[PDB]
Structures are given as structure tokens and as C-alpha cells.
């Protein structure tokens, strides 16, 4: 999975940045053909962690999920994956207003897709956000940031930790439990800022009000012009109880039939 340095090609514009480091666009020459690609650069537990992060990029082959194609060590750790070009869905939608309902209809029951087979392979996400979708082209979404995700024990449904507040379900914040019902209901925020057009969610509030709030029973209004469906599977997300919760499966057949 070890990529040659010299058939990498970096541009210097970046395309975004994290604790890790930055992303840059860059040129792999593969076979025959040159693929474009998009470079996580390493900035001292950074590179265990974007090695984990490779070890379930790895893993994992789906139409919507981004592709790794390695890692190379040069002057830093660098995690190469497939470039999809368009970038992340918030940013898209604050940028593009007029995308029709149905279309976002088609890009957020992708990403369902993507977790429904997540949730299939036993990984939790755990970093689910309208920022983590990418846009290979309009109708063509796929979930990355894989730099949180746990491969959950055979015999347990949840990881413990031993943090994006406003996408985490009560028991992450009050028990540190991780499943892929918190990823359900992280996927419900996802889909009140992709309705939103990319707008953040529970604006100006602290985390500990967004606690409050959800434990009286209270969630997000209904962003304008989202489609009353979308907002009722938004709010069936948002249960608070993680065994009444629906999972990926349902989350994605109710997504389909619409
Ligand atoms: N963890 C992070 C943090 N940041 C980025 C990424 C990231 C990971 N990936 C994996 C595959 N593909 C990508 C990708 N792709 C991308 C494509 C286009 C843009 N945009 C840059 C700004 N741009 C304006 C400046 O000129 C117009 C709009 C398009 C950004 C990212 N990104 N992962």
C-alpha cells in the first residue's frame, strides 16, 4: 500500500486543513494513466493516528465512500486518495442555492448508502458531518474522514472512549458510546445542514447548551423550504433513545422509497 515519492506531484494550493496538517491537491501516475488526487500531509501521535486512518481506508470498498489509493513517506507521512473535485457539501450549498430538494434528496440518501455499508462492516464513523461529504460531481456524494473511526470488537455493538458536540447523540456526550445509531443520528445533523444549504447547526449556542436543549426534548426547527419527509426522518435521527434509534438499514430504505 507504499506509493513512490517520485510519482507524486503536489500543487502548492491547499485544499484544506486539520490538526493533522493540510490537504493538497495533487498528480499520481498510476499504470498508464495519471490519476488526480487529494494529499493529506502530516504536520507526534499524528502519524499512529493517519496510519489508523489508512489501516480502515483500507479496508473499506464502496461506490460512496473516497478512495484511498496509499500512503507514501517522504518529507512527511502523506495519505493519497482519490480527488473529488467539487469538495465538501457544506460549502457547495452556501455557494450553490439552487440544487433542487431532489437533488439533495439523491446526495443525502448516498451518504446513507456509504454508512448503511459502514454500519454493514462494523465501523463507526464518529465524525459525521456535511463537512466530511465530498462531491465527486452534483449527483455524486462520498463520505470521507476516516481519522476518528473505530473497527468495533466482534462481540460489542459500541466503542468507549476513554469532539464535534453539536453532531453527537446523547449517550457519546453523557456515557462516551460510540455506534452506528450515534452515527444515525450525527447523519440526521448532516441532513438539517444539507437542507440548510451548509449552514451550521444550533448557531451561537455552546455545547452545553446544545445538551440542554436536546435533553428537554428540543431540536432544530425545519430549515426553510426542506421537504416535511426529509424533516420527519431528520427528527427519527434525533430520537434520544439509542434502542428505539433507527439504524442505517432503515434510515436507508426509508431514504430509497422516497
Ligand atoms: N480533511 C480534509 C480537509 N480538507 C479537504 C479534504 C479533502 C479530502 N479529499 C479526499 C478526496 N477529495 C478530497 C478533497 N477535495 C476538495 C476538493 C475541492 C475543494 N475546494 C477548495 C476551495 N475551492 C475554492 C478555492 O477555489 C474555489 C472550492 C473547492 C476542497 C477539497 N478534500 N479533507
Given at each position: 500500500?507504499?506509493?513512490?515519492?517520485?510519482?507524486?506531484?503536489?500543487?502548492?494550493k491547499?485544499?484544506?486543513?486539520?490538526?493533522?496538517?493540510?490537504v493538497?491537491?495533487?498528480?499520481?501516475?498510476?499504470?498508464?494513466?495519471?490519476?488526480?488526487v487529494?494529499?493529506k500531509?502530516?504536520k507526534?501521535?499524528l502519524?499512529?493516528?493517519?496510519?489508523?486512518?489508512?489501516?480502515?481506508?483500507?479496508?473499506?470498498?464502496?461506490?460512496?465512500?473516497?478512495?484511498?489509493?496509499?500512503?507514501?513517506?517522504?518529507?512527511?507521512?502523506?495519505?493519497?486518495?482519490?480527488?473529488?473535485e467539487?469538495?465538501?457539501?457544506?460549502?457547495?450549498?452556501?455557494?450553490?442555492?439552487?440544487?433542487?430538494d431532489?437533488?439533495?434528496?439523491?446526495?443525502?440518501?448516498?451518504?446513507?448508502?456509504?454508512?448503511?455499508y459502514?454500519?454493514?462492516?462494523?465501523?463507526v464513523?464518529?465524525?459525521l458531518?456535511a463537512?466530511?461529504?465530498?462531491?465527486?460531481?452534483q449527483?455524486?456524494?462520498?463520505?470521507?474522514?476516516?481519522?476518528?473511526?473505530?473497527?468495533?470488537?466482534?462481540?460489542?455493538?459500541?466503542?468507549?472512549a476513554?469532539?464535534?458536540?453539536?453532531?453527537?447523540?446523547?449517550?457519546?456526550?453523557?456515557?462516551?458510546?460510540?455506534?452506528?445509531?450515534?452515527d444515525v443520528?450525527?447523519?440526521?445533523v448532516?441532513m438539517?445542514?444539507?437542507?440548510?444549504?451548509?449552514?451550521?447547526?444550533?448557531?451561537?449556542?455552546?455545547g452545553?447548551?446544545?445538551?440542554?436543549?436536546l435533553e428537554?426534548?428540543?431540536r432544530?426547527?425545519?430549515?426553510?423550504?426542506?421537504?416535511?419527509?426529509?424533516?420527519?426522518?431528520?427528527?427519527?435521527?434525533?430520537?434520544?433513545?439509542?434502542?428505539?434509534?433507527?439504524?442505517?438499514?432503515?434510515?436507508?430504505?426509508?431514504?430509497?422509497?422516497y
Amino acid at each position: 500500500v507504499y506509493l513512490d515519492r517520485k510519482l507524486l506531484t503536489l500543487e502548492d494550493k491547499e485544499l484544506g486543513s486539520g490538526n493533522f496538517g493540510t490537504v493538497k491537491k495533487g498528480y499520481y501516475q498510476m499504470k498508464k494513466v495519471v490519476k488526480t488526487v487529494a494529499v493529506k500531509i502530516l504536520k507526534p501521535a499524528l502519524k499512529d493516528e493517519l496510519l489508523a486512518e489508512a489501516n480502515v481506508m483500507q479496508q473499506l470498498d464502496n461506490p460512496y465512500i473516497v478512495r484511498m489509493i496509499g500512503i507514501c513517506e517522504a518529507e512527511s507521512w502523506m495519505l493519497v486518495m482519490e480527488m473529488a473535485e467539487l469538495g465538501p457539501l457544506n460549502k457547495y450549498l452556501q455557494q450553490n442555492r439552487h440544487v433542487k430538494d431532489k437533488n439533495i434528496i439523491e446526495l443525502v440518501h448516498q451518504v446513507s448508502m456509504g454508512m448503511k455499508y459502514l454500519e454493514e462492516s462494523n465501523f463507526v464513523h464518529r465524525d459525521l458531518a456535511a463537512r466530511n461529504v465530498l462531491l465527486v460531481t452534483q449527483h455524486y456524494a462520498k463520505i470521507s474522514d476516516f481519522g476518528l473511526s473505530k473497527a468495533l470488537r466482534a462481540d460489542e455493538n459500541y466503542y468507549k472512549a476513554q469532539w464535534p458536540v453539536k453532531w453527537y447523540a446523547p449517550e457519546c456526550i453523557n456515557y462516551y458510546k460510540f455506534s452506528s445509531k450515534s452515527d444515525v443520528w450525527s447523519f440526521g445533523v448532516l441532513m438539517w445542514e444539507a437542507f440548510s444549504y451548509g449552514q451550521k447547526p444550533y448557531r451561537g449556542m455552546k455545547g452545553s447548551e446544545v445538551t440542554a436543549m436536546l435533553e428537554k426534548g428540543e431540536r432544530m426547527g425545519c430549515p426553510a423550504g426542506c421537504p416535511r419527509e426529509m424533516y420527519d426522518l431528520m427528527n427519527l435521527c434525533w430520537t434520544y433513545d439509542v434502542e428505539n434509534r433507527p439504524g442505517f438499514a432503515a434510515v436507508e430504505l426509508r431514504l430509497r422509497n422516497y
